[model samples]
Target: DEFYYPSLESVVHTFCVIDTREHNRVSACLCKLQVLCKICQTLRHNLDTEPFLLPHLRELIIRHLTLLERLSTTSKFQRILDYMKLSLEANDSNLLQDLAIGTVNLLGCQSPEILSIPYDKDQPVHEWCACFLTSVDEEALRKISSMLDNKHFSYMYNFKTFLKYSLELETAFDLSTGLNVLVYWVSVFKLFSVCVQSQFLLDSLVAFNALFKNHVKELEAIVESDTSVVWAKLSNLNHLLHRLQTSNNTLVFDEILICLRGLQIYIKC
Candidate 1:
């Protein structure tokens, strides 16, 4: 037994292969992998395959805890219990953070969220700013390939807004617009449009909407002078919700509310 200890990498890699091949042996594989991951590099990589793998694993272990309840007197049960202990050690917070931020990055500029914005990073901030603050709605291909259509610009605004408000940051202004401050709220709208189009950022959008609904009175008072944009966005949101509901997709309701709410808050000033 003492001479049989495989190198750490081999043990972990073999466990992964076995775990992948045999569904019934997953518990043991997981246990072995966890121990190896703590002492090696190979098994740690698999945890990144899913964002909430740890949470899902815990749920499974709890649900199937009863499976071992009956085999308690057997050596197999004792082995399973040992595996469960190791499985519980798979708390990967560092990886989780990377996953969350990574998801945001992957979603950040990709279209239909980023649909029309070209890949050129040469444009001035003012150029991108005008893409929203100005009414041109179209940029000449030779001039600014990164120009987002009116719809995408608005969606980016919503995304920015959600990010700003969620993070509670100071207002960011567009230097080109003298007094017109730009914040994440503006990005929220732009990105919300993209999300709705692709059905991806529904959670963020729904959360924004709920925030808006809760502050309707405040929003009305602040935007009393410029109701058109607010009204238009609300209309857009309504259409978005109606479309999703009809399609039997209710996942992004909260995100919708959040985006709407962030919009209202951003407009208050």
Candidate 2:
């Protein structure tokens, strides 16, 4: 039932997934979910408190939150981990379980906090995406497109299907850092969640201004220094940002979806 879910539960379940070995795709999604949930936890802090993290308590909350929440995280984590273990049982990584544990570690550690993550007010999920497109090697993107072309490469919309299927957890996760940048996305997404209990394309298109205003110049300078697809990708994002400042709702919505999908698969790596 998608009827009721709270922010705390999302943060808790993310940690709970730490030890399972599910299917690789599922594991990947869960890992991505954990990241978004962590983002949500970050946002909640901004709104509710100063975001002081409690490592042990965070873990404990997910692990033992009045049985239902605890069971949900445990079952999902174990089920996925078991699946992954059987499928790639030979591959030593067992990435799903590893992801679950990593989720716990991400929330537990207090050092090297992630800050000023990029999201824009109007563009809900663009930065999450822009970073994805900007982070990858060209070879990997080609391979991914080749393998999942039916699921991903059909159209930009199809690509979004792949991205959301893989990163749908973001719907539940905090996404604040990105949300902060894409305040419009966060606001609308939460609004949709409140109104429909489901995320839907909003009435107005979203946009971002002052994107990584601090980091864009630095990134531009570095991209200029490098001679590779990464540089080109970053440049494209920069150029796109300029357009976003002027784009309307219809165009902006499409762009935001594209960006979210791109970021989830490529940037947050």
Candidate 3:
């Protein structure tokens, strides 16, 4: 529906603008900055190809979003921060591949690395991703393990794929925080459901469904756990692993998907 995506080098200058702000720092080049993000999220190749998140691009994206955070704290500014980080995840070359492998491992449940954290006062689905992202033994999985536990779900973290890249947020969110980061992925992914589906859709949501299908039961095993953690007409599952709450649960879902596909996945009706 639009022109094809450009390269990372093309957008580097836009990020540079924010860095070299003269006076109208906040106002300066915001549109171009926005443009850079818009383009980055565009499919760099086939859906199977994992878009634009090559190492060099990742390096700069981290550089700019962190830098942007230092420059402004306005909700408006934070708005872009969310988009930028989400873009990082969306571009994750390994995203679908990792999830696809994780789905099978989760289904088998034979591997200790493939842990199933049932839903609870908080949905650990997001933290569980830290493990695929694997289990508690992995070094990086510890990032959220410390932050989670009766911690929260619904809202944790975004970009294009991530919107906020789930695992990396701290400080003032004007409210609260990463389950929501991953929530966007799952709740928003609800759209990919259909009796008939697309090839691209098969990559992300289908694997997501198979992987998470067993997880719900882990919680349901409890008497009256109510156990319905994921989506509308039923749904599936996030990143980061903690401080995400039983609170803000609904609000986080609405905006994330409402923002994602314009289809309501959470609590609009």
**Per model, how many backbone clashes are there?**
56, 31, 27
Compared with the true structure, all predictions reach lDDT values of 0.35, 0.33, 0.34
User: Using Cα atoms with residue i matched to residue i, what is each candidate's TM-score against the true structure?
Assistant: 0.19, 0.20, 0.19
Model 3: residues with Cα > 4 Å off, grouped in runs: 1-108, 112-118, 132-269
For model 3, give the 10-residue run with minimal summed lDDT. Answer: 236-245
The digit string of per-residue lDDT tens for model 1 on 1-269 reads 11101232444476667667754332332333233323212111222232453354344343334343443445544454444434444655343223222222222322125334453334433334344332222432212222233233322222222333323332332222211112122222233323344543333334333333433333344445334565776565556545544542323444444545545454445
Per-residue CA lDDT of model 2 for 1-269, tens digit only, reads: 11111233443464456435443443343344334423323322322321222222223223322222222334554453344333322334433233233322322232224323432334323333333332344554453333223221111122223333334223332323222212222222222222222221111011012212323454455334425545454555556545645653234434433543553456445
Best by TM-score: 2
TM-score of 1: 0.19
Of 2 and 3, the candidate ahead on TM-score is 2
Q: Cα miss at 136, model 3 (Å)?
A: 11
